[PDB]
Design a protein around this ligand. Structure first.
Ligand SMILES: *[C@H](CC)[C@H](O)C/C=C\C/C=C\C/C=C\C/C=C\CCCC(=O)O
Ligand SMILES: *[C@H](CC)[C@H](O)C/C=C\C/C=C\C/C=C\C/C=C\CCCC(=O)O
Lengths: 293, 293
């Protein structure tokens, strides 16, 4: 039983990290690159990049704790707690050399603490489509002159009483299609089959709850990061952001400039939030080139 | 056939206005005062203030179109379309004299245009707990350092594909309790019995949909008021806002000073959104004193 199709030459496997059984898909040879997905998705969002990267690198794509086929965390869902799991997972496979890190959406939240605290273990960093949790997220408007905003899910998912689980249960496929397409610039890349796969995966009760616990921990992650951010990142970093509807535009690079000394960014026109699927080829190309320099 | 208990000496009745049958509760004698409820509730939110006002006033409390026992509007749900219905209803009972207006929450949205277009018809005005729809609402934050903001429902309710009705159907009783209490400071007044009453009213399918149609017309209402705001209100007005969790605090009066020449404002400590219920004694006293001047 696999929730998503594994590409040729890759292996679906599990590893215990601090008592928590983590699922991942792994292939390739060479220095290690870890790819970390975001909300609504799983390791599978990288399935197009992974065979290309695996020509020059060892590639590992974990499911975040509680999501996909990984067990929920036993400590908690703030960035610092989850980052321990992802760091220790990567160390098992690259204990003698730095590794590269590519992260999308809440993968950023869940990896930034381990990067800033183990800078010598990270060779190069790619961050795409999510603010690092800090005071800036408090400025994002709740409502726009065009209709619903793109960040009101922060409060919906953070709300207590299990509000999001209760309202979305029974309607997981419907809600996820609306959520994805409303943050997408190009909706045609999400077939009905792909949406069925993602919806069945996050509809598992523990995965549905886990998805929102990351947001229930968001303010704790902001407070954690106010102390972490006294140390700027020193490794080579690239940011990617969509330039169309759902994309973060210039905010991604401009925020990262406050955290990183050596940073380059790109904004991809015609693309929204789901860069690996909406703009697979140009994103794949910029990732591979940046990590191969 | 009453969704809520009519107070002693009042009558539940209906008036056809522009093809639309509006429900209302009415009692008392003297100059007319109209009380307009907001989202999540009906005329019944006024049922404690009405017996007191009726000692000196003719009091009418209609259900907004689509909500309570009132038919949906045949024109639409923008502030200027709904305000026609309420102006016409009031003027059937007060054709020869100005009347007083008290509005709560989206009652403000649905009365402001008729007040500015017919200033000689409004003797005194009391607005509580809502922004008048304008560009200020596009700066309300999606997310706060305390947690979920109070205004993210703007985007939730406005979202297309009938997102809100689709998620909330079958869970209307659960959602109303969460929504009401999360916007309250004095939550203990929302007994299960009272929550049952309001939930069975807005859970009527055309009422659940009507509820969100007001938010789907909000951007139109914003654009309508942009023209109308070029003329400031000339009649004595009072604003009330909660000072506690769910209250709008100083925003209510500060925004109203841009719209009204003659305006006094009160912030009530320990009270959130639902002033008639959370803080009946101070609120009723404030409204009665203001209107009797
Ligand atoms: C993952 C999203 C699925 C994570 O929760 C959020 C990360 C990115 C945020 C979503 C994309 C767009 C965000 C920034 C746009 C800039 C300002 C937004 C404010 C108002 C609006 O137009 O939405
Ligand atoms: C009816 C609400 C049930 C209507 O849709 C909205 C009117 C009232 C909203 C209730 C509370 C709003 C309180 C806060 C206003 C203050 C500043 C705006 C930003 C909100 C925030 O949480 O920071």
């Amino acid at each position: 039983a696999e929730e998503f199709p594994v590409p040729n030459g890759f292996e679906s496997a599990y590893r215990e990290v601090d008592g928590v059984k983590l699922h991942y898909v792994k292939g390739g040879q060479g220095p290690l690159v870890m790819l970390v997905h975001g909300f609504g998705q799983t390791w599978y969002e990288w399935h197009q990049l992974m065979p290309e990267l695996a020509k020059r690198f060892t590639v590992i794509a974990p499911d975040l704790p509680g999501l996909g086929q990984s067990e929920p965390p036993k400590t908690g869902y703030s960035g610092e707690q989850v980052a321990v799991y992802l760091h220790k997972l990567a160390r098992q496979f690259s204990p003698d050399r730095p590794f590269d890190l590519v992260a999308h959406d809440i993968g950023i939240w869940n990896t930034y603490p381990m990067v800033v605290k183990n800078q010598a273990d990270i060779a190069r960093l790619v961050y795409m489509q999510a603010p690092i949790p800090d005071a800036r997220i408090y400025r994002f408007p709740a409502f726009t002159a065009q209709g619903e905003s793109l960040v009101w899910h922060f409060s919906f998912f953070a709300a207590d009483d299990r509000l999001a689980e209760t309202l979305i249960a029974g309607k997981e496929r419907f809600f996820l299609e609306h959520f994805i397409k409303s943050h997408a610039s190009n909706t045609e890349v999400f077939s009905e089959r792909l949406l069925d796969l993602y919806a069945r995966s996050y509809a598992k009760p523990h995965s549905l709850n886990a998805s929102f616990e990351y947001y229930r921990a968001l303010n704790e992650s902001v407070r954690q990061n106010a102390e972490l951010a006294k140390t700027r990142l020193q490794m080579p970093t690239m940011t990617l952001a969509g330039g169309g509807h759902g994309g973060m535009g210039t905010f991604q690079l401009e925020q990262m400039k406050a955290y990183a000394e050596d940073v380059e960014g790109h904004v991809l026109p015609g693309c929204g939030h789901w860069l690996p699927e909406e703009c697979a080829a140009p994103m794949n190309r910029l990732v591979i080139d940046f990590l191969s320099r």
